[PDB]
Design a protein around this ligand. Structure first.
Ligand SMILES: *[C@@H]1O[C@H](CO)[C@@H](O[C@@H]2O[C@H](CO)[C@@H](O[C@H]3O[C@H](CO)[C@@H](O[C@@H]4O[C@H](CO)[C@@H](O[C@H]5O[C@H](CO)[C@@H](O[C@@H]6O[C@H](CO)[C@@H](O)[C@H](O)[C@@H]6O)[C@H](O)[C@@H]5O)[C@H](O)[C@@H]4O)[C@H](O)[C@@H]3O)[C@H](O)[C@H]2NC(C)=O)[C@H](O)[C@H]1NC(C)=O
Ligand SMILES: *[C@@H]1O[C@H](CO)[C@@H](O[C@@H]2O[C@H](CO)[C@@H](O[C@@H]3O[C@H](CO[C@@H]4O[C@H](CO)[C@@H](O)[C@H](O)[C@@H]4O)[C@@H](O[C@H]4O[C@H](CO)[C@@H](O)[C@H](O)[C@@H]4O)[C@H](O)[C@@H]3O)[C@H](O)[C@H]2NC(C)=O)[C@H](O)[C@H]1NC(C)=O
Ligand SMILES: *[C@@H]1O[C@H](CO)[C@@H](O[C@@H]2O[C@H](CO)[C@@H](O)[C@H](O)[C@H]2NC(C)=O)[C@H](O)[C@H]1NC(C)=O
Ligand SMILES: C[C@@H]1O[C@@H](O)[C@H](O)[C@H](O)[C@H]1O
Ligand SMILES: [Fe+3]
Ligand SMILES: [Zn+2]
Ligand SMILES: [Zn+2]
Length: 341
């Protein structure tokens, strides 16, 4: 009744979820699926209650009647007066990132280069950059723009998966879960850093979190911010310090979603879980921390300070905003109102 079933995507989220479940005295239990879409289907059936979604997936889920419940909020320099839970969310910066050493690569010379995407259907990794590229090219053949990519969730035999690596054993090439080596923000940035691709479509925060000693992960140990450049829409290249003047869009924060009839109960439970396991929680450093997973963004983004109440009790369309929503609608007309399942 007052027990919430979390949906985990893939085996590593399942493991973190199992630890959370144990620590919460089974106030939270876990269902697992191989993809985010499969998790949304579990929620629709009533077999799971909730999961934290990227903006692009909130759009999929919303068309099926799921609703935003609480949003990730990270640290801000403005609005510092208000408590984290009550503070408005700011949104993250979607950016395109290249190596400094790859000279003369600009936004206007991306055609036939190698790209690294978080996953198909995601905001910074897919919807924003491909929407821009479709508009600019006047063509829906975005699968022929780049010579080779890693875009988890695309056909494994296509060029959109050519650069994906799969797991330790080479299995699960291009699956949109953290088994794929180049999945997610961190995976797409790794694909760039290892020089598999020429450009990575990620958010501003990923670059900072994985450079200048901020990670310690073996591939990121020695990465320096100065070795990277952002691509701006005016054809220039800028240091990573200038993302406020050199980004592709501001994205709505990742948010917990649930079935409408469950929303109120999911919200109550999660507010109490973060008091126990969130940033300054009673049990975090000691027993368990909800918002940590060694740079791997499992369940929630590691930079999350708290989950925030929404206010204006927004629908999915209001939460995402009219800007972003019409961008996805236009791109989706390349690949009609209804749930996708
Ligand atoms: C791209 O992504 C990166 C990564 O996410 C991001 O950089 C991070 O941004 C955070 C800032 O928003 C960084 O700050 C945090 O970490 C520092 C560690 O050094 C901590 O140190 C202090 O924290 C205190 C308390 O919060 C700060 O004091 C606050 O209060 C004062 C009141 O006087 C205010 O200062 C003012 O700030 C304004 C606006 O910036 C400035 O113009 C004024 O001149 C004035 O000085 C302000 O409210 C302060 O926050 C104190 O100043 C220190 O910050 C904190 O805990 C802090 O929260 C975080 O470290 C960054 N991460 C990393 C890894 O580098 C980028 O911002 C992002 N870029 C874009 C464009 O979004
Ligand atoms: C790829 O290209 C496509 C096609 O161009 C883009 O889709 C278009 O995006 C436009 C920008 O979002 C969009 O423009 C319209 O803008 C109006 C006005 O926006 C207003 O903002 C005001 C803030 O000052 C605010 O006061 C207003 O309330 C309002 O929000 C929006 O309203 C119009 O629509 C009404 C339709 O009946 C009309 O009555 C009214 O007078 C306005 O004209 C409107 O919703 C819309 O956002 C445009 O509609 C989109 N075009 C098409 C054909 O769909 C994508 O964004 C591009 N992709 C990317 C990633 O950039
Ligand atoms: C699991 O959830 C329960 C229910 O919310 C928590 O126990 C409740 O504690 C509150 C006050 O803190 C009481 O008002 C309720 O009576 C309790 N519920 C019942 C029926 O036991 C409990 O703290 C949670 N446990 C953990 C570790 O998260
Ligand atoms: C936290 C939440 O975030 C967005 O939905 C809006 O900016 C809104 O104003 C705020 O309440
Ligand atoms: Fe995202
Ligand atoms: Zn902007
Ligand atoms: Zn409303």
């Amino acid at each position: 009744y007052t027990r919430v079933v979390w949906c985990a995507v893939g085996p590593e989220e399942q493991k973190k979820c199992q630890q959370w479940s144990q620590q919460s005295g089974q106030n939270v239990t876990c269902a697992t699926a191989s993809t985010t879409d499969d998790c949304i289907v579990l929620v629709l059936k009533g077999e799971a209650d909730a999961l934290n979604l990227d903006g692009g997936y909130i759009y999929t889920a919303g068309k099926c009647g799921l609703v935003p419940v609480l949003a990730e909020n990270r640290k801000s320099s403005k609005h510092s007066s208000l408590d984290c839970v009550l503070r408005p969310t700011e949104g993250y910066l979607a950016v395109a990132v290249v190596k400094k050493a790859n000279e003369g690569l600009t936004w206007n010379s991306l055609k036939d280069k190698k790209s690294c995407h978080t996953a198909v259907d995601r905001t910074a990794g897919w919807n924003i950059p491909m929407g821009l590229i479709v508009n600019q090219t006047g063509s829906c053949a975005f699968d022929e723009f780049f010579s080779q990519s890693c875009a988890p969730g695309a056909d494994p035999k296509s060029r959109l998966c050519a650069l994906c690596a799969g797991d330790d054993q080479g299995l699960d090439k291009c699956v949109p879960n953290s088994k794929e080596k180049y999945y997610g923000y961190t995976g797409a940035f790794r694909c760039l850093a290892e020089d598999v691709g020429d450009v990575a479509f990620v958010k501003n925060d990923t670059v900072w979190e994985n450079t200048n000693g901020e990670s310690t992960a073996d591939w990121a140990k020695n990465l320096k911010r100065e070795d990277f450049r952002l691509l701006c829409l005016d054809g220039t290249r800028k240091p990573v310090t200038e993302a406020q003047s050199c980004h592709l869009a501001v994205a709505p924060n990742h948010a917990v979603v649930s079935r409408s009839d469950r929303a109120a109960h999911v919200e109550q439970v999660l507010l109490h879980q973060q008091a126990l396991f969130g940033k300054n929680g009673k049990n975090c450093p000691d027993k368990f921390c909800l918002f940590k997973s060694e740079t791997k963004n499992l369940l929630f983004n590691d930079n999350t300070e708290c989950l925030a109440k929404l206010g204006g009790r927004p629908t999915y369309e209001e939460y995402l905003g009219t800007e972003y929503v019409t961008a996805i609608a236009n791109l989706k007309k390349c690949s009609l109102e209804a749930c996708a399942f």
